[PDB]
Amino acid sequence: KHKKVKLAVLRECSNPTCGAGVFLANHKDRLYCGKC
Amino acid sequence: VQTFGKKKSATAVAHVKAGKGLIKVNGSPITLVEPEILRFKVYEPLLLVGLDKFSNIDIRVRVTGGGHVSQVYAIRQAIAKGLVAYHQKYVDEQSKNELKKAFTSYDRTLLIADSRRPEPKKFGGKGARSRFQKSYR
Amino acid sequence: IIKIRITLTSTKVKQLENVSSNIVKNAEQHNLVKKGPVRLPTKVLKISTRKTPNGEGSKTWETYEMRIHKRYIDLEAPVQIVKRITQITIEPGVDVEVVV
Amino acid sequence: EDRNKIHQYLFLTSKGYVKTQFSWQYYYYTLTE
Amino acid sequence: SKKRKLVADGVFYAELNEFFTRELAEEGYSGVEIRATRTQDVLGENGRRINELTLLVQKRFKYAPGTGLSAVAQAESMKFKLLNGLAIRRAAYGVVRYVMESGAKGCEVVVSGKLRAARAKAMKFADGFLIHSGQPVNDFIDTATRHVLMRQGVLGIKVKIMRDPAKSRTGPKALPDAVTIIE
Amino acid sequence: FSHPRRYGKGSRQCRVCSSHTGLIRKYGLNICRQCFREKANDIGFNKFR
RNA sequence: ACGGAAGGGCACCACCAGGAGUGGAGCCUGCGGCUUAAUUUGACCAACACGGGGAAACUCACCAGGUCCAGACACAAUAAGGAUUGACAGAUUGAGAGCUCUUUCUUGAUUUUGUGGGUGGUGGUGCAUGGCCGUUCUUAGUUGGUGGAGUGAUUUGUCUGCUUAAUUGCGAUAACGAACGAGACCUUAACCUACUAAAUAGUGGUGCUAGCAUUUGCUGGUUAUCCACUUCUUAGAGGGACUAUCGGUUUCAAGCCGAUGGAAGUUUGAGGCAAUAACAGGUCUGUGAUGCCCUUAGACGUUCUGGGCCGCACGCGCGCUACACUGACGGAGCCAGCGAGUCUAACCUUGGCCGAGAGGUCUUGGUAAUCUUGUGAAACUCCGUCGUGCUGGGGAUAGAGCAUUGUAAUUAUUGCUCUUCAACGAGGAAUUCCUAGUAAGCGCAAGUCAUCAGCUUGCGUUGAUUACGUCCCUGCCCUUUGUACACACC
Ligand SMILES: [Mg+2]
Ligand SMILES: [Zn+2]
Ligand SMILES: [Zn+2]
């Protein structure tokens, strides 16, 4: 039932193949990228 | 010269040659075929016509294919038929004829291979002709 | 001239023999030396099964049989005769294999 | 792209142009005019 | 191996037969050689259909790109006749009479199923000479079993032909029991 | 997502009906006992005795 | 067509005369009953080791939980600022499952929700069906042409009587000549000092022959050690049996009975195929065979976790062990046949190594007449002890430990060693199968198998008694007969 809130109009990690648009969510000690 | 003989599935091949009264069965002498009751069944195709009656012939037979008594019957048929062939080709046709007469007067499928073959077993029951059992009611 | 072994396997006896027997004449017409055609025993692929798709009726089993027959010949022929004898034998239904 | 891969391997089956048979469990497909 | 190899060849033959019968039904398929009641749509638009079928069979079987009187044929034709619409009894009668005048020495068509709702009956049409059964039925008889899928129910159609032993052109040329002398 | 089924009836099925029962895993058939009986003569299995 | 009508005939799905059993015990197993969350369902001579169903994941269709869409194709919705999907940080369910949530991030015109519509079902309906099988049928029947009898529907032919497995045939005869089915056909198991060809089989003459004996002779290894052969084996064309000959019985004959010959004289033994038709026989729980309905995103679709089908006051059937001296236990002798087996890889395993055993280890041979495999099997023979006993037959019953199969042996898979030797001391009324390589005893291979047989399908070793028939019973067929039945006794 994941709703995926609309996310209305708005750093970086390893694996530099990402196109500099993978700004993370800074909850705590977030060294874990959203990709993997 | 060479003959073969069978009773149910065991085939025995016997070579008879001009030699000195040596009759083997599987490498052992005829005194030690060892069914321990058919030691005279194997003696029969030699004791029938004469006591020894042969010191000039050598018969070596090799038998495989069946069971103990089946192989005994196979060898006792094969050596008798080898003797018949040896007399037919070398010794005399008359002599072959009078020994065939004795073989047929004591016929024990000695000269003719027994045609009794195991009949195929059919579905629905152990054994060819006996069927499984039903009680139903 | 090289030595070869020709193997024929099939289920159709008519074509199997029609091939294994013209091979002998194909060799003799060129006057070759060969060991005769050897018939390795026919093996039956008999398999029993239950006739009905369910469990009613008297227990009746029916067997299906697939008889596979197969021969082998030794020959001595040059590469040209080898390719000729492997090219004429394209009879559909008999598997032919040539080893050197 | 996850669909473009198959769309380009060929050279949805109900829009048209694609005849599908089963024919012993292998999902045969043919493209037609 | 050899037994496994030829078993694989046999199941591959069955695969070819089933696939070709399902796909090439519209062209009047009879059996894999391929054999169709007309040998013109086999080529089609100068080879398009056969090239497509070769491509499909290669893709399936991992193959290299470069390496009238038939019982099944008449059965599928009469299936098409029933499916696209014609009286069932009339269709069976037409099929049997056609096979009869096409030189075949005997025909039998059995149609079973829900013609009209009932307890499903079996209606038959048998003409000429037929022997069933023995070895000579494998020798000279062609049999086909077909499932007709109409909008209501399924009809089982069995078509059996006793082909003329005289015009055999292979194997025995007469009946096993045929005894004829000259004087 | 999917637990291993590298053995057993979850691994093997009839290539025709996909039935896990009646499978003939002999001679390289991998085909059901009922599909076998139906389409048997097309494989080469004849009835002789 | 049916009859709670009669008469013939046939059948070890009947008997006579017998053999071996089952029913009496334990246990494997299926069915009924009982409760459980379910102990899944179908089937009641022709159900009950049957559903090739020997159920730990899957099988499974059941119960309790957990996901997911793999809801085709249209329609409209910020969805061209975004529709959806996934996601680590954490509680959360076994689940490292973003099931959900605290929470903000990737890509972005595939999706989600509506709106139909669907797709699948081991969901029901086999009183809607197809196919297929079983039964009627380990029987035998059915049909037209010409003619005859009938106004006719129809009938005769298709039969009194004999003979056959047989509507097989003789014979009698208003029938004659025929057709399908039965026979015929084919498969196989017998033979063939005849043909064809064989280090993918076998046998003999030579050197590689170590033993014994030494005038040379017996077993003898030498798998690329030469030659030839096909008698033994293999498989292709073919031959043989057709009841042949002779006696007798035979209505007149079909046939049958004895002896001889024969390879085999009961269709040569055994099967495959098997008609005109009917069953409210079984299967929708094999089929991507299928009419109708149900379900459809809290699913009856798929999938995962655990159980379950095995369960125990009880009843029934098919079976193995069985109850002992024709025996048990040890050595000892060593004889099969059907077959199965991995080139996309872990199958049959040989020979060494370890282990008492199970089992593991180095390999090796085999894609196969080559290697397992000569299946060095059991039963059995021989030699010893046991002494006639619930014992030393039985290993039922549980515990302890030892390993492999299995991601999983708990609800003993199985094997192994030890420990108790329990019921069974020959089985009531009853009751099953069976007539010579068959009964029975014995084991082998194959299907299910990642592992397990007591099941089945084939195979072979040892190989009897009784009779060579009858209608006493049982079953069915035919004929006659009654019918107010014709949807045909539901
Ligand atoms: Mg009549
Ligand atoms: Zn990244
Ligand atoms: Zn199948």
Short mmCIF file of C-alpha atoms (C1' of nucleotides) in Angstrom, two decimals, chain B residues 1-4 6-13 15 17 20 22 24 26-27 34-37 58 60 62-71 73 81-82 84-85 88 104 112-137, chain G residues 13-14 21-22 45-48 189-193 202-205 216-220 231-233 262-264 266 269-272 317-320 333-337 377 379-382 431-441 455-464:
data_model
loop_
_atom_site.label_atom_id
_atom_site.label_comp_id
_atom_site.label_asym_id
_atom_site.label_seq_id
_atom_site.Cartn_x
_atom_site.Cartn_y
_atom_site.Cartn_z
CA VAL B 1 33.64 -82.22 -34.21
CA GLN B 2 31.83 -79.46 -32.26
CA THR B 3 28.29 -79.63 -30.89
CA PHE B 4 26.01 -77.64 -28.59
CA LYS B 6 20.47 -76.72 -24.19
CA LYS B 7 17.70 -77.65 -21.77
CA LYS B 8 15.99 -74.41 -20.68
CA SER B 9 18.46 -71.54 -21.17
CA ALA B 10 21.91 -73.01 -20.48
CA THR B 11 23.93 -73.76 -23.60
CA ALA B 12 26.90 -76.14 -23.45
CA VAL B 13 29.38 -76.31 -26.33
CA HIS B 15 34.53 -80.12 -28.78
CA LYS B 17 38.63 -84.75 -30.94
CA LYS B 20 43.01 -90.10 -25.01
CA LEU B 22 39.58 -87.19 -21.43
CA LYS B 24 35.89 -82.45 -19.00
CA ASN B 26 34.12 -76.95 -16.89
CA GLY B 27 37.78 -77.78 -16.32
CA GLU B 34 28.94 -81.78 -8.29
CA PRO B 35 25.18 -81.48 -8.34
CA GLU B 36 25.75 -84.23 -5.76
CA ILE B 37 22.69 -86.05 -7.04
CA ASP B 58 38.48 -86.33 -25.91
CA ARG B 60 35.88 -80.69 -23.64
CA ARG B 62 31.91 -75.30 -21.65
CA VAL B 63 28.45 -74.40 -20.38
CA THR B 64 26.75 -71.13 -19.46
CA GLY B 65 23.32 -69.56 -19.48
CA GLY B 66 21.00 -71.27 -17.01
CA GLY B 67 21.04 -72.94 -13.60
CA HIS B 68 22.74 -75.90 -11.93
CA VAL B 69 20.50 -78.71 -13.15
CA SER B 70 19.85 -76.87 -16.43
CA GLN B 71 23.59 -76.77 -17.10
CA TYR B 73 21.23 -81.33 -18.64
CA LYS B 81 25.57 -85.16 -29.38
CA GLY B 82 29.31 -84.60 -29.78
CA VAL B 84 27.04 -88.83 -32.14
CA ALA B 85 28.68 -86.32 -34.48
CA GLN B 88 28.78 -89.76 -37.83
CA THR B 104 16.59 -92.98 -28.03
CA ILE B 112 16.80 -83.29 -28.97
CA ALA B 113 16.86 -79.97 -27.13
CA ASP B 114 13.90 -79.48 -24.81
CA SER B 115 11.43 -76.95 -26.21
CA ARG B 116 9.94 -76.04 -22.82
CA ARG B 117 10.40 -72.27 -22.64
CA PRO B 118 9.14 -69.92 -19.90
CA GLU B 119 5.94 -68.30 -21.12
CA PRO B 120 5.75 -64.48 -20.84
CA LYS B 121 4.01 -63.15 -17.74
CA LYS B 122 0.92 -61.04 -18.35
CA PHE B 123 -0.33 -57.94 -16.55
CA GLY B 124 -2.80 -58.13 -13.69
CA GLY B 125 -1.16 -61.05 -11.90
CA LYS B 126 2.10 -62.54 -10.71
CA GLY B 127 3.00 -65.35 -13.07
CA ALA B 128 2.02 -65.89 -16.68
CA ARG B 129 -1.29 -67.70 -16.16
CA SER B 130 -2.13 -67.24 -12.46
CA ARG B 131 -3.80 -63.90 -11.78
CA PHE B 132 -3.82 -61.68 -8.69
CA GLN B 133 -6.60 -62.26 -6.29
CA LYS B 134 -9.86 -60.48 -5.86
CA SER B 135 -12.41 -60.85 -3.17
CA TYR B 136 -14.47 -57.83 -4.04
CA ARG B 137 -17.36 -59.95 -2.72
"C1'" C G 13 -13.79 -63.84 -13.77
"C1'" A G 14 -17.60 -71.70 -12.32
"C1'" G G 21 -3.08 -69.74 -0.63
"C1'" U G 22 -6.53 -65.37 2.01
"C1'" C G 45 -18.43 -58.62 -10.08
"C1'" A G 46 -16.61 -54.05 -13.54
"C1'" A G 47 -14.36 -49.87 -5.93
"C1'" C G 48 -10.68 -51.26 -1.48
"C1'" A G 189 9.65 -68.21 -27.92
"C1'" A G 190 11.08 -72.48 -29.63
"C1'" C G 191 14.93 -75.06 -34.83
"C1'" C G 192 18.30 -74.07 -39.03
"C1'" U G 193 26.32 -79.21 -38.29
"C1'" G G 202 32.39 -66.57 -29.84
"C1'" U G 203 35.93 -70.98 -31.27
"C1'" G G 204 40.31 -73.40 -32.76
"C1'" G G 205 46.64 -73.32 -35.01
"C1'" U G 216 54.39 -82.92 -24.24
"C1'" G G 217 49.84 -83.67 -22.20
"C1'" C G 218 44.94 -80.33 -18.30
"C1'" U G 219 43.59 -75.34 -16.42
"C1'" G G 220 45.54 -71.82 -18.42
"C1'" U G 231 29.35 -75.02 -34.78
"C1'" C G 232 28.18 -71.65 -29.65
"C1'" U G 233 25.97 -65.63 -29.92
"C1'" G G 262 9.26 -84.43 -35.80
"C1'" A G 263 12.21 -78.93 -33.27
"C1'" A G 264 7.69 -78.27 -31.97
"C1'" U G 266 -3.79 -77.71 -26.65
"C1'" G G 269 3.32 -71.91 -26.54
"C1'" A G 270 2.12 -66.66 -25.33
"C1'" G G 271 0.29 -62.07 -26.88
"C1'" G G 272 -0.92 -57.23 -30.22
"C1'" G G 317 -9.45 -56.27 1.19
"C1'" C G 318 -4.66 -57.02 -1.75
"C1'" G G 319 0.13 -58.30 0.38
"C1'" C G 320 5.67 -59.63 3.06
"C1'" G G 333 30.41 -74.62 -4.08
"C1'" C G 334 29.22 -69.62 -8.16
"C1'" C G 335 24.17 -70.47 -12.31
"C1'" A G 336 20.95 -66.86 -15.15
"C1'" G G 337 17.55 -63.65 -18.27
"C1'" A G 377 21.59 -63.06 -7.38
"C1'" A G 379 16.48 -70.14 -4.08
"C1'" C G 380 19.65 -74.48 -4.07
"C1'" U G 381 24.26 -78.31 -3.20
"C1'" C G 382 28.06 -79.74 0.38
"C1'" U G 431 -13.06 -68.00 0.52
"C1'" U G 432 -9.16 -66.49 -4.15
"C1'" C G 433 -6.01 -67.98 -8.41
"C1'" C G 434 -4.70 -72.00 -11.32
"C1'" U G 435 -4.34 -77.40 -15.91
"C1'" A G 436 3.15 -77.90 -17.69
"C1'" G G 437 8.08 -74.57 -17.89
"C1'" U G 438 1.80 -72.98 -16.03
"C1'" A G 439 1.04 -73.57 -9.82
"C1'" A G 440 4.16 -72.65 -6.25
"C1'" G G 441 9.13 -71.22 -4.01
"C1'" C G 455 3.42 -52.05 -5.08
"C1'" U G 456 3.33 -52.91 -10.03
"C1'" U G 457 5.58 -54.16 -15.15
"C1'" G G 458 8.88 -57.52 -17.43
"C1'" C G 459 12.78 -61.29 -16.64
"C1'" G G 460 14.95 -65.54 -15.44
"C1'" U G 461 16.60 -70.23 -11.59
"C1'" U G 462 14.11 -75.09 -9.00
"C1'" G G 463 9.81 -77.13 -11.20
"C1'" A G 464 5.04 -80.76 -8.82
#
